Structures are given as structure tokens and as C-alpha cells.
């Protein structure tokens, strides 16, 4: 045979480990162009310990909310590219 | 067929429609609290004709540029919950 289907959860990994120079050179003409200030402080709250279900989405949903925008951005492009040659 | 609409009840189109207290409801603990405290819009304009090759690559990286944060979190786990039990 060809080979295994392999991995999907790999593709995240890589956005983890790669910069914004990578970023800019995959996004290109679709890269942001800032907008959104700066500030500062807490908002105030604290964790009351974690709580989970099904663990899919909570693996997933914390490395989309530590993400940037941008990574946000290449991650989607990878498993859309990814999902149309399996099968 | 040259091209075509695409349907009305994609998680895109569906996720432009939505409220930030909607997307709320679903990201939970992993919302934004930046910005306002509850995040917003970004990305700007666009310029110049596409490429003659492909384009679902293109529209899709086009429309995720100018989504929300939020939003962009939320198109994902909309589509990660429905790939995951194919069959």
C-alpha cells in the first residue's frame, strides 16, 4: 500500500512551534494590518478549578483561544488542504 | 458548472449571522477577555484581481481575515464537532 492516513492533530503542533515570519509568507496579501490598540490589567475573576466534556473539544478549544489571529488563520487553511486528499 | 452560491446554512454563513453573546454560549471558559473585555472585529479591505488557480483556498482565507476572534474559534469547533463522526 501507499501509506497510513497518518495524524491530524500534528497540524496544530506545528502552528504552536512557527513565527509570525512563517505566518506572513503562507497568509500573504490576506496577513492583518493591525487595528486593535493596546491596554492592560487583570478584567478581574480567578479560576474555580477546570471542568471538561467528550475531551475533544477541550484539547482543541484552548490551543484555538492560546493562538493568534493569524495562526487561527493557517491552521484552517492546513486541515481544509489536509481533508480533500484523504479517502 | 463554472461556479455557484454555496448553501445559506454553512458554519461560515451561519457564524457571520450570530451575536457575541451566541458565540458566549458555546466558547464558555476559553471566551476572549481582551479588547472591550469581550473581543471584535478586524482585517480591513482588499485590493487587486485573484489568482488564475484554485479559489476555495482564496474565499475562505478572504472571509476568516475580516471574522472576529470569537468568531474564528467558534467556525472551528462548529466544524471539528462534525468531521469527527463521519462514517
Redesign the interface.
Given at each position: 500500500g501507499p501509506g497510513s492516513y497518518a495524524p491530524l492533530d500534528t497540524e496544530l503542533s506545528e502552528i504552536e512551534g512557527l513565527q509570525d515570519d512563517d505566518l506572513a509568507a503562507l497568509?500573504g496579501?490576506?496577513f492583518?494590518?493591525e487595528?486593535?490598540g493596546s491596554?492592560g490589567g487583570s478584567?478581574g475573576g480567578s479560576m474555580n478549578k477546570?471542568?471538561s466534556s467528550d475531551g475533544?473539544?477541550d484539547d482543541?478549544?484552548?490551543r484555538?483561544?492560546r493562538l493568534s489571529?493569524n495562526q487561527?488563520?493557517a491552521?484552517?487553511?492546513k486541515?481544509?488542504?489536509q481533508?480533500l486528499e484523504q479517502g
Open positions: 497568509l496579501k490576506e492583518i494590518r487595528g486593535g491596554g478584567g477546570p471542568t475533544w473539544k482543541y478549544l484552548s484555538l483561544s489571529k487561527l488563520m491552521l484552517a487553511l486541515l481544509k488542504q481533508q
